[PDB]
Every structure is written in C-alpha cells, then in structure tokens.
Write a protein that binds this ligand. Structure first.
Ligand SMILES: Nc1ncnc2c1ncn2[C@@H]1O[C@H](COP(=O)(O)OP(=O)(O)O)[C@@H](O)[C@H]1O
Ligand SMILES: [Mg+2]
Length: 758
C-alpha cells in the first residue's frame, strides 16, 4: 500500500500530509479561541478572537487588534481545537458554526487538497488549476476500500457506491449539485470514468467497444448542449441523468442519459461576452471549402446569431480543432457519413434563418427585398422556398370556425421564424439523445448507478419562468436528503441497547412545494396552465391572479410592494422574485401550424423524422388537446424521484472558490455563502442536535486517557475500560451518550481534555 510509502504522491496530493510524530509533544497550547467578525456590520469575514474568562454569559475578548468587546455566551462562534483543523469528516468537529466550518476547509483547500468529507456530503472546492489526482495509479488505489479506509476523493464515492450495488443488490445514485461553474461535470465525468476500470469491461487493460461508445458520448453532449457564459466556459444549457447498467455477475451492460430543458433561446441570443452553442463555433473552422460551399458559409462573424454576442474566441481554446475531437466520438457511435452532413447541414439552416431580415412596406406588413438568405434554409432543409415564406408571412389561422391566412406585422413575423429555430434545436438535441440511447442502453437491465447532474437553485437578477422550474427540483431533491436521513436515523435508533424518544420533522419545505405545483387548491403552474389555454388574456391579468389567491393568505409568498410584473416565493434558500414576460406565451409554447404543416414534408431522414415522428413533438393527453410544458414537467419529474425512492442515494455538494474564476484565492464571501443555505451544514447540525462528534470508539481511549492516569494505552474492552477515565475526569451522564461499538463524547465539553494536557 503506497499509503505506507510516504513519498508516494497520494500523501502530498490528497492527504493533509501526516507529519512524522503522533504524540502530545506536537501542536501545543492550553488556551481557548473564538471566532469574531470585527465589524458590527458585514456578516461574512470573521477573525480570531481570544477568550479571557469563560464567564456565565459575557464571553471575554482580546481582539486580533487587542480590544475588549464582549459577546454573549451563545453567539460567539468559538474556534475548533487545532488538533483537528483540516480533518476529513467535518462531522468530527466539536464546534460547527459558520466560521469554524469555513476554517477546517480553507486550510485543506489551502494545502492543495480539494476534497473534504462532511457528514455524508462530499464537499469539494473547485481548483481552477490542473491537479494530478486522476492518473490510473489513482484508480488503482481507491479500489475496493471503505470511505474511512482511504482518502477523501470522488473515486471513493463510487467504488463505495459500487461494491455496495453488489452486496445489497439494489441500484444506486450519485448526486452532483451546486452553484454554477461550481464543477459537477468535471467530477460527474471522472466518476463515470471510475466506472470504466473497476468494473471496466475491457478484457485486457483499458477499453473494448462499449466503453468508448459510452465514453465519447460526452464530447457530443457538449458541442451542442454546452455554452460559454459569465460564470463558466463549459456552461450547461440543460441538465442530465445518466445511469450505468450492469448484470448480476458484476459487469457493465449499456447505459443511459436524460437531458432536461435546453437554453433553447440562447440559440438566438448571446448576452455580451457570452457565446452561442459551441458546435456553431466549430463547424465554421474545422472544415474545408468543400464544406462551406457544400453549405454556403462565410467566416464565423458574418452570422447575426454569432456576432451580436460581443465575442467569439476563447482564451486557450482551439475551436478549430475542438471540432475534430467531436467528429470522432460520432464515428465511434457508428455515426455514418451521411449521418453527420445531415446533423450539421441541418444545423447550418439555423445559421441562415438568422441572416434573414424581415423588411417592410405594404402599409404595415413586413416583406423581403432579399430572398438570397432564405434561399439556403429552403435550400439545405429541402423544403419550399415560396411557402417557407408564404407560411412565414401569411400563415392560415383559425379564428372561431374559419380558416383565415393572416399576415403578422413587421414584428410578429420575424418572431414566428424565431420559433422555427428552437424547434430544430430541440428536436435535433432530442434525436441525438435517442440515438446514443439506442446503441448504449440494453433491455435486460440489472442494477444501476444513476448519475444525475443538474443545477442547485442559484439566485439572479431576472428569474424568468425557466427557473421556477429548476428550484422546483432543488426543493424536491432537497426535501429528499431531508427525509432519507430520518429513515436512516431510525437504524442506529434500534441498536445501542436503548432506543431514543420518537423524533418527527416532515419538512416545512412542503408548504412551498405545493405553492408551486398544487392542484387543489391550485398553485402557480395550476392557475398558470389554466390561462395558458385562453389565447386572449395576458400576463398582466395573470400576474394579477397569482396575487388574488396568495397575497396575504399563503405564508411562502410575497407580492411585490411596488412592481406590477413581479411576485416572490421563498425557498430552501429564501425569497425569489419572478418575472411574467411570456410566461403565458411559453407554458403555451406555440408555433404557427402551417410550419409543421410544411416541414412535415422534407428530403431528409432526420429533418422529416423530427416533424413526422410523434415520439418527438407530441406530449401526453389532458386539456382538450396536447398538454403544456409545465404540465409535462411536473409529471416527468416524479417519474424520477419515484425512481430514487427505491435506490441508495449518494450526495455531492459542490462549492465554488470565487466568482472571478481564478485559482489560489478563496473569497471568504462567496464560499461561506454557498454553505449556509445548502443543506450540507444543515443535515449535520441536525444530527448534532445530540452529539455531532462521533467516533469508532477505538480512538478516544487512545486519543485521551493519560490526562487521567487511570485508563491505559492498551486496554482491550474500553466498554468496561475506557470508563475509568470518566469517574476521574468527571463527565455527567447528560454530558455524553456513548455506544456499544462507536461513541460520541458529549455534544459539548470535549476539548477540556482534548486540547491542553497529555
Ligand atoms: N476538480 C477540478 N479540477 C480541475 N478543474 C476543474 C475541477 N472542477 C471543475 N473544474 C473546471 O472548472 C470548470 C467548471 O467546472 P464544471 O465541471 O464545468 O462545472 P459545471 O458543469 O457545474 O458548470 C470546468 O471547465 C473545469 O475546467
Ligand atoms: Mg454539466
């Protein structure tokens, strides 16, 4: 075991770097320290405070500056004994207060260790620097060992999830969730990879066929789904749910993927300094004049879906060659030659529909002084150019009982084409998922290691509809970890030789989970999906009802004191104000109907299958006709949670270092404020509710029995032996609650013997 080998990098990389000695002749003082934040204002940003007299209430001070301010007995965030700093399970801690939490990891992150265990949650802060914790030799270690057995590292979360699958014979699920850019996909990508060797199908070391088939799906799910943004460069327009399929005899079979809402509108809008889908900025470089010609193409700047952005290039990124990498992960999936010209050549239309400009002069009606640019979409789509517009400008619309071709004004006209776009990108993203799925996921399935990555509720300036959705989730998945731990808090509840007094919770987050989704009495998507069908009433009247029902009667809600387009719900993180622009127009999500009418018929096997194959456009039944996008979401959701309500979960709370995207500095502002709102802290403050500090009971008796020369170094049954240092150091029965295998020395008075004397 390289762990023996001191030199073996794993010591310097993932471990605090155990020092030579293990005795009391080491880290030494005898006093007590408390965390104080010197400014009577700014909360975050604490500083070391010294204690002067542990009085009944008035805690005594000596500020780093040397002052004498005095806080109460119950608000002075005290500071953990140093024997501990940079310890793997934050649970081990005897004081869990925001500073005393941000400290134990500031330091470890500081020593180049990014991974620290906390209760269950593997917390990991994002480096931004390239670190060698991923080599095969790495794989080789965390293999077949216990969480405690070896280092805090992602590989552990899985090997564990892995053996587990085949020792209980139930499917499992890893959950990587947290702040944007915060890095889920970098680990989510390294776990699947661990799933590549420990259970790796390769007969001989490496991979065979399914492995790369499965391994180069990503380049794909990225060049089309992923965008650069303000908080990342590999930002994820959607979310995903990949499970890995094995047999009863220990090996991989096929696999899975489950995408959610794309940033479908980003296709047509790139805020300053943010780019459109990555594939767009590749197909224009990694090709030839037999490809630009093959599909009318000018340099990646002439397109008004790419320049309006304010940026194209990516510091340190061969967009040009980044394209090759993705064309091979196609070939491997058996992506055929005709199969790629079509995906792209079908993308290329979406570029052009952009260089098309709706002019206007027939009184008020848009027209086209230039047919050239359409001459391509009609061209590369292989549809009607005359109707393409003729269905564009004057579509037939049913007003009452009559079929009457209208003519949208200079504005509603272009706007309508702008719909024919997400349509290709949604349906096209969609078909790329169906396709992988087909060549990867088998039928005779057995166990699964479900990996889902999707975004924690992050709060922002405008919060359009799309988001009321992705908190709906982090409100649901948040309730889960809340509930699951309760049912597990019954177990150790059965065997300690005494079974504690029934404890209940229920999660008050339930009131809000209704506010959003409730049928009777109805909630946001309920009264929303009601007006989504009347095609006359508008936002103002809608943002007006969500105030009728709730303003002043429903606790978790806040009508805007002033704005008449806002409204505010309150989540597991707190208040959020939402917008009402097109909420109606989008749950509704329409598109003029002579378009599916005219596209349904094409020269393509992939242009046509998207408008003709209901496994693509249609939803399920209800309203009187095809259901609505928020309706779909609510049902498609529980299909998942009720798909974890049978497996063993595995959690990963991801944490970002700074919103500046730079390595080697930890904002004591950003980081500490991803902490307090997310349950990571919260699910262990709860279990502390008794004694947060719990241990294997092999250590304490070796960790402290000489300050009381009564219990030895090698006593065999401390069950009858470690006792002799309690009736001599003197810990009252309330002062702790031990166990018959493990122990948890008092919820509070523990350091009075842990940091001071032998
Ligand atoms: N543990 C890590 N080591 C090195 N780089 C990382 C690590 N975690 C994240 N990154 C980098 O941070 C960037 C953002 O992380 P990412 O995994 O893409 O998060 P997300 O998908 O949530 O936006 C990535 O482009 C990646 O380069
Ligand atoms: Mg991702």
């Amino acid at each position: 075991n390289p762990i023996h080998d001191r030199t073996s990098d794993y010591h310097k990389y993932l471990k605090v770097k155990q020092g030579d000695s293990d005795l009391f002749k080491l880290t030494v003082s005898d006093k007590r320290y408390i965390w104080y934040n010197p400014d009577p204002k700014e909360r975050d940003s604490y500083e070391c405070g010294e204690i002067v007299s542990e009085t009944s209430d008035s805690f005594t001070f000596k500020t780093v500056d040397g002052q004498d301010r005095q806080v109460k007995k119950d608000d002075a965030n005290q500071r953990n004994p140093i024997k501990f700093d940079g310890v793997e399970d934050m649970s081990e801690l005897s004081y869990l207060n925001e500073p005393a939490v941000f400290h134990n990891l500031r330091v470890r992150y500081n020593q180049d260790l990014i991974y620290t265990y906390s209760g269950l949650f593997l917390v990991a802060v994002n480096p931004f620097k390239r670190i060698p914790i991923y080599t095969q030799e790495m794989v080789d270690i965390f293999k077949g060992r216990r969480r405690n057995e070896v280092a805090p590292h992602i590989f552990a979360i899985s090997d564990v999830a892995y053996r587990s699958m085949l020792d209980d014979r139930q499917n499992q699920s890893l959950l990587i969730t947290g702040e944007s850019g915060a890095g889920k996909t970098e680990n989510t990508k390294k776990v699947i990879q661990y799933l590549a060797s420990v259970a790796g199908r390769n007969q001989a070391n490496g991979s065979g066929v399914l492995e790369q088939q499965i391994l180069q799906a990503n380049p794909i799910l990225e060049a089309f789904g992923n965008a650069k943004t303000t908080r990342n460069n590999n930002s994820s327009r959607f979310g995903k749910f990949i499970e890995i399929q094995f047999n009863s005899a220990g090996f991989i079979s096929g696999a899975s993927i489950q995408s959610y809402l794309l940033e479908k509108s980003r296709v047509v809008f790139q805020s300053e300094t943010e780019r459109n889908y990555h594939i767009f900025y590749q197909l224009l470089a990694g090709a030839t004049a037999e490809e630009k010609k093959a599909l009318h193409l000018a340099g990646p700047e002439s397109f008004n879906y790419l320049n309006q952005s304010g940026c194209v290039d990516i510091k340190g990124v061969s967009d040009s060659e980044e394209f090759k990498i993705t064309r091979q992960a196609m070939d491997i999936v058996g992506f055929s030659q005709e199969e790629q010209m079509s995906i792209f050549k079908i993308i290329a239309g979406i570029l052009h529909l952009g260089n098309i400009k709706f002019e206007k002069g027939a009184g008020e009606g848009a027209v086209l002084k230039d047919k050239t640019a359409l001459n391509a979409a009609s061209t590369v789509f292989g549809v009607n150019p005359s109707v393409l517009e003729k269905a564009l400008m004057e579509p037939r619309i049913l007003a009452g009982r009559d079929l009457v071709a209208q003519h949208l004004n200079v504005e509603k006209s272009s706007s309508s084409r702008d719909a024919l776009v997400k349509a290709l990108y949604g349906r096209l993203f969609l078909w790329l998922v169906k396709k992988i799925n087909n060549v990867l996921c088998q039928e005779r399935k057995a166990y699964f290691i479900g990996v889902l990555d999707i975004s924690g509720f992050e709060i922002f300036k405008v919060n359009s509809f799309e988001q009321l959705c992705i908190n709906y989730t982090n409100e649901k998945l948040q309730q889960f970890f809340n509930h699951h731990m309760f049912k597990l808090e019954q177990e150790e509840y059965l065997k300690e030789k005494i079974n504690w007094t029934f404890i209940d919770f229920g999660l008050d987050s339930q009131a809000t989970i209704d506010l959003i989704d409730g049928r009777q009495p109805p909630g946001i998507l309920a009264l929303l999906d009601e007006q989504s069908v009347f095609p006359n009433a508008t936002d103002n009247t809608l943002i007006t009802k969500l105030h009728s029902h709730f303003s002043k009667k429903n606790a978790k809600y806040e009508e805007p004191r002033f704005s008449k387009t806002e409204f505010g719900v309150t989540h597991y993180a707190g208040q959020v104000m939402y917008e009402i622009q097109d909420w109606l127009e989008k749950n509704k999500d329409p598109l003029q109907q002579d378009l599916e009418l005219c596209f349904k018929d094409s020269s393509d096997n992939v242009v046509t299958k998207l408008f003709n194959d209901p496994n693509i456009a249609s939803r399920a039944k209800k309203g009187a006709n095809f259901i609505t996008v928020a309706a779909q979401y609510k049902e498609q959701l529980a299909s998942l949670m009720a798909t974890l309500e049978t497996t063993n979960p595995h959690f990963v709370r991801c944490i970002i270092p700074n919103n500046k995207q730079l390595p080697a500095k930890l904002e004591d502002k950003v980081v500490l404020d991803q902490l307090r709102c997310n349950a990571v802290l919260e699910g262990i403050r709860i279990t502390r509710k008794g004694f947060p500090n719990r241990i294997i009971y092999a250590d304490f008796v070796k960790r402290y029995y000489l300050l009381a020369p009564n219990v030895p170094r090698d006593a065999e049954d401390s069950q009858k032996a470690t006792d002799a240092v309690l009736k001599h150091l003197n810990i009252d029965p309330e002062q702790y609650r031990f166990g018959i295998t493990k122990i948890f020395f008092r919820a509070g008075q523990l350091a009075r013997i842990e940091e001071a004397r032998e």
